[PDB]
Amino acid sequence: GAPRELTWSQLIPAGAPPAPAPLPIHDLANALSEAGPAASQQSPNAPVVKALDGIEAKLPGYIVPLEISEAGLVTEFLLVPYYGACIHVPPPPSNQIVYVKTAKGVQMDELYQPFWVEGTFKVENASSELAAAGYRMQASKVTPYEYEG
Amino acid sequence: GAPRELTWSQLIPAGAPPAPAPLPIHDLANALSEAGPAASQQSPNAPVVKALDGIEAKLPGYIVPLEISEAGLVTEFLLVPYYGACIHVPPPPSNQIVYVKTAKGVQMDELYQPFWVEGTFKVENASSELAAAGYRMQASKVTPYEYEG
Amino acid sequence: GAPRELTWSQLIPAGAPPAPAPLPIHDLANALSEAGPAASQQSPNAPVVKALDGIEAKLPGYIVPLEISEAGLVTEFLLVPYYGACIHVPPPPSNQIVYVKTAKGVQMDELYQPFWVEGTFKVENASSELAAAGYRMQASKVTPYEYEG
Amino acid sequence: GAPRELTWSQLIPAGAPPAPAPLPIHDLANALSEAGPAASQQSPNAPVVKALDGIEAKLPGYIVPLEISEAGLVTEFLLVPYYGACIHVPPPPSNQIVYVKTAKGVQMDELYQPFWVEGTFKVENASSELAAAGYRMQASKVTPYEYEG
Numbered sequence: 001g002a003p004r005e006l007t008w009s010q011l012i013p014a015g016a017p018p019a020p021a022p023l024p025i026h027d028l029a030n031a032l033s034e035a036g037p038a039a040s041q042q043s044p045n046a047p048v049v050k051a052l053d054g055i056e057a058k059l060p061g062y063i064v065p066l067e068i069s070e071a072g073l074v075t076e077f078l079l080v081p082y083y084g085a086c087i088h089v090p091p092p093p094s095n096q097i098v099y100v101k102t103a104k105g106v107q108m109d110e111l112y113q114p115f116w117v118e119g120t121f122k123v124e125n126a127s128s129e130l131a132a133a134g135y136r137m138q139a140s141k142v143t144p145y146e147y148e149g
Numbered sequence: 150g151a152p153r154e155l156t157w158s159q160l161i162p163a164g165a166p167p168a169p170a171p172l173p174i175h176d177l178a179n180a181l182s183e184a185g186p187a188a189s190q191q192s193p194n195a196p197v198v199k200a201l202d203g204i205e206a207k208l209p210g211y212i213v214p215l216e217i218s219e220a221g222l223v224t225e226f227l228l229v230p231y232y233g234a235c236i237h238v239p240p241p242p243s244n245q246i247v248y249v250k251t252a253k254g255v256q257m258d259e260l261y262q263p264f265w266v267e268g269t270f271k272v273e274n275a276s277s278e279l280a281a282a283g284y285r286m287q288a289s290k291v292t293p294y295e296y297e298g
Numbered sequence: 299g300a301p302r303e304l305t306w307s308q309l310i311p312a313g314a315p316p317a318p319a320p321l322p323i324h325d326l327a328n329a330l331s332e333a334g335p336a337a338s339q340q341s342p343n344a345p346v347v348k349a350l351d352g353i354e355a356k357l358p359g360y361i362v363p364l365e366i367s368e369a370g371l372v373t374e375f376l377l378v379p380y381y382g383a384c385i386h387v388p389p390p391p392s393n394q395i396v397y398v399k400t401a402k403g404v405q406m407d408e409l410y411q412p413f414w415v416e417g418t419f420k421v422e423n424a425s426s427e428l429a430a431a432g433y434r435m436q437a438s439k440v441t442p443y444e445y446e447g
Numbered sequence: 448g449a450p451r452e453l454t455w456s457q458l459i460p461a462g463a464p465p466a467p468a469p470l471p472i473h474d475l476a477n478a479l480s481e482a483g484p485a486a487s488q489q490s491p492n493a494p495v496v497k498a499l500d501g502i503e504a505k506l507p508g509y510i511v512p513l514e515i516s517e518a519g520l521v522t523e524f525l526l527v528p529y530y531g532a533c534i535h536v537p538p539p540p541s542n543q544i545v546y547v548k549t550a551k552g553v554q555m556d557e558l559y560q561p562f563w564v565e566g567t568f569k570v571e572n573a574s575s576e577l578a579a580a581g582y583r584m585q586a587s588k589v590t591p592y593e594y595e596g
Binding site: 186213214215216217219220221235236237256257258277278279 | 363370428
């Protein structure tokens, strides 16, 4: 049925540390840069909200592509709360990342904007060399986040 | 001399409301979209940290261009803590925006990445049709935010 | 009335040199890089088709922004036949550039795609530090170039 | 050894049709849009220069990603002479496309700029759902096209 809209803060359980500054201080960005690609994500096994497992959810975010289809579309990606996550700044904690799989791919070109990702939501570990995630989603719909200034 | 590095949280005075979710909930983004371009920025006159006035500061962020030079470089812009601010999502509160003027312009092309903005920091109101800011900066240096995954 | 659709080749008069390779050979790109910003455009006063003066025209191309409005939109720009012209590769000849002025601005974000520029077409010189143009246009409509793969 | 620099025109044999307008006329772009994804590339089996087979070559161009690595880098792509090829405009003829495989991947972010692709050059057919190519390359080096305005 209709997806339950989520916020990124609903993916952090009660008592767990909040999401850090999306733009780390200079000394920290340099320390994580000097450290290996392993050390990039400082909370790769962050606590997860187990009551979210199996629901139909809807979450906004930016797309970090992981796989391209035969058709030239992104079919596997990380959903993150901010643009540049894993690329321009360190990865977010693993409870601020969703590993998404979609049959209806997204155009590689239009990934500068945020999107709404709707689908079956799972509390299952997912790893990539780029980042670890505590959540997974089999998307039904990937639609641009609409906002007019 | 050497600039004092700032965080975006140091631009919010003690007792003032914290910065909201950079990705508003669907009903809120639609409410601000339906409302005029005036209503886009919900805190246009947010409290400011007056002890910051006149210092040499350094702050990281994303560039929202406002003016292009004869040379095809951005010489006036808003420094914001997240990509897409004012364009893809509503503007941040006015105490989470710096109106920057630079003699050494930035290339329009390379604005997909975050930057370090160093210069003389002022606690002075600055308005644009896009957003109001509680801070101003006359930048000495605009350099890309360096981070290796 | 209805605009006359133009091709970039219709902007080059009979007998005039054709447009060069949009991706110059390595030694040439280095020679123009080593040479001043003046030398970037090798044909800044290329012959123009005078029979085009005063018509209602429609031409496809990429936007090189020159001026930003109060609203954060591009209101003055160069229309070029290829992406990156003047920025990533040398400027095209001046008879392969249109200096466009528009009241209905274009979003700075969506300049990765080509557009259709319709409006009053003039055979008048226009200079910028970035490049010289032999044509001008007061655009009525700036609409994205539609194509589905 | 040192790669032989190529131009895109050296990939078209003597007597073969030249590369068409990179920005098709409106009626043509609509005709190819209305037609299936098969019909997008109008010359999918364009004549090739067989004397190029086995050489160490260097060619400039734009990257159309086809495959992403575990590390989040593009390791398989189409090298095309213009930005937007296959995405914003129809694919170029198959003798104006190189199917490239690289061990040293390219960052997904920095694909807005042209590159120099050096490596072993083969005259071998390569197909994708996006476009057919008459040339292949096992790249040794993928470096940004350097040019200063």
